[PDB]
Amino acid sequence: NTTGGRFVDKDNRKYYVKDDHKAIYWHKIDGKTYYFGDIGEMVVGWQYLEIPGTGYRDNLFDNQPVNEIGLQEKWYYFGQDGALLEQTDKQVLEAKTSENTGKVYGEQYPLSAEKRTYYFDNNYAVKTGWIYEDGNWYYLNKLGNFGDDSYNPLPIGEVAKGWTQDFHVTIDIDRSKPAPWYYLDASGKMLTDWQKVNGKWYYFGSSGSMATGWKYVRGKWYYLDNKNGDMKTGWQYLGNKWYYLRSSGAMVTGWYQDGLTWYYLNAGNGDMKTGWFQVNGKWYYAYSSGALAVNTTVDGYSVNYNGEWVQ
Ligand SMILES: CC(C)[N@+]1(C)[C@@H]2CC[C@H]1C[C@@H](OC(=O)[C@@H](CO)c1ccccc1)C2
Ligand SMILES: CC(C)[N@+]1(C)[C@@H]2CC[C@H]1C[C@@H](OC(=O)[C@@H](CO)c1ccccc1)C2
Ligand SMILES: CC(C)[N@+]1(C)[C@@H]2CC[C@H]1C[C@@H](OC(=O)[C@@H](CO)c1ccccc1)C2
Ligand SMILES: C[N+](C)(C)CCO
Ligand SMILES: C[N+](C)(C)CCO
Ligand SMILES: C[N+](C)(C)CCO
Ligand SMILES: C[N+](C)(C)CCO
Numbered sequence: 001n002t003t004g005g006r007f008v009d010k011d012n013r014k015y016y017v018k019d020d021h022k023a024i025y026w027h028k029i030d031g032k033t034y035y036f037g038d039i040g041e042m043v044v045g046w047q048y049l050e051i052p053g054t055g056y057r058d059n060l061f062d063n064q065p066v067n068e069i070g071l072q073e074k075w076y077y078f079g080q081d082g083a084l085l086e087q088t089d090k091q092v093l094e095a096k097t098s099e100n101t102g103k104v105y106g107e108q109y110p111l112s113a114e115k116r117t118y119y120f121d122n123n124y125a126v127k128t129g130w131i132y133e134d135g136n137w138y139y140l141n142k143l144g145n146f147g148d149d150s151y152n153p154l155p156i157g158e159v160a161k162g163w164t165q166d167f168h169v170t171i172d173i174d175r176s177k178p179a180p181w182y183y184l185d186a187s188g189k190m191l192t193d194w195q196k197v198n199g200k201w202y203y204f205g206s207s208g209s210m211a212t213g214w215k216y217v218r219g220k221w222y223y224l225d226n227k228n229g230d231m232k233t234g235w236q237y238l239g240n241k242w243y244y245l246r247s248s249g250a251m252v253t254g255w256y257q258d259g260l261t262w263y264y265l266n267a268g269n270g271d272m273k274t275g276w277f278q279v280n281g282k283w284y285y286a287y288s289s290g291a292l293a294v295n296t297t298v299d300g301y302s303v304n305y306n307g308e309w310v311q
């Protein structure tokens with residue numbers, strides 16, 4: 001809603017001058033939106049800026065005070081004429097790189113030979129987070145790359161690929177909130193259910209979040225690394241108890257013979273039994289290793305070839 005001034009070309013830059021002053025920051029002029037930075041140089045192309053609309057970085061001129069405000073920064077796209085692209089859905093645009101962002105009108109720079117589909121929110125900023133398209137979920141980076149004492153916002157809004165953690169993010173990551181892991185394939189499609197990645201199995205369920213710990217899937221129990229999510233197999237000591245997982249990863253219950261040795265996995269919980277235990281009337285004795293005692297004596301007690309306590 002800025003009127004009364006005029007655009008001016010000087011020193012290879014463009015400004016908007018009203019009553020002798022240069023427009024700074026965000027301005028809505030004659031049906032279009034522009035951004036003039038801190039000193040008035042109209043911007044063009046890709047820009048990572050403080051969000052507009054609060055009034056703290058809007059309708060301002062360089063002769064006015066720039067009160068201190070804390071505003072999140074987001075990616076916006078401006079035409080070569082400086083007009084903000086007021087997209088709220090999506091649009092194919094030159095990819096943003098280290099060579100075509102933060103430029104101002106008058107500067108010379110190359111146009112990305114590569115175009116990409118960028119998604120936008122209802123306030124014309126590049127969208128981040130989850131998006132659903134043509135039957136699949138895609139994740140647009142909420143964060144840029146951290147270096148130690150360094151941050152690059154370029155990845156924000158780009159389609160994520162591979163292992164990706166979904167943090168709660170605003171200006172910074174919210175460490176108190178949960179951050180599930182997801183896996184996006186080569187085209188960015190979010191994987192669901194069982195998937196073998198880098199030689200190991202992971203379970204992403206229906207929501208796509210990587211499962212950890214014990215997980216009940218289609219009538220069977222599986223154990224995924226409590227931290228890394230990879231499916232375990234074979235004998236596993238969990239919670240001070242032994243469990244046997246088949247090569248398929250499914251937990252075994254009942255009698256199980258490993259080589260010549262029998263073991264008994266608790267009917268429901270699946271934990272390996274030790275000591276004397278009864279099964280369908282019969283009594284059996286398992287050593288501390290869980291191995292069933294057979295054709296021998298156990299503290300004055302005889303047990304036959306099936307480990308059954310002989311009367
Ligand atoms: C390259 C930009 C900064 N312009 C110099 C172009 C397009 C906007 C600005 C000034 C001029 O265009 C306008 O004055 C009209 C065009 O509709 C306009 C200005 C600002 C917002 C919306 C429209 C020519
Ligand atoms: C906790 C899960 C989601 N990981 C972070 C663990 C195990 C899988 C995932 C990523 C990583 O596992 C990997 O195999 C590493 C090896 O460099 C990896 C990271 C990103 C892409 C491919 C492999 C560490
Ligand atoms: C004759 C068998 C079936 N017992 C009754 C004997 C030997 C095993 C079984 C129970 C008991 O032997 C035990 O070791 C005791 C020890 O508390 C036991 C009782 C209940 C379950 C498991 C062991 C006495
Ligand atoms: C959804 N896209 C932008 C991510 C990829 C093309 O299928
Ligand atoms: C993939 N998501 C949209 C489904 C779920 C994360 O909240
Ligand atoms: C975990 N699965 C993919 C490996 C096997 C189901 O039987
Ligand atoms: C495998 N268990 C320990 C997880 C569950 C049985 O109810």
Ligand SMILES: C[N+](C)(C)CCO
Pocket residue numbers: 235242289290
């Ligand atoms: C894991 N153990 C103690 C259970 C069995 C021998 O392999």
Ligand SMILES: C[N+](C)(C)CCO
Pocket residue numbers: 255262292305306307
């Ligand atoms: C150990 N067994 C003989 C007892 C039972 C499995 O069939």
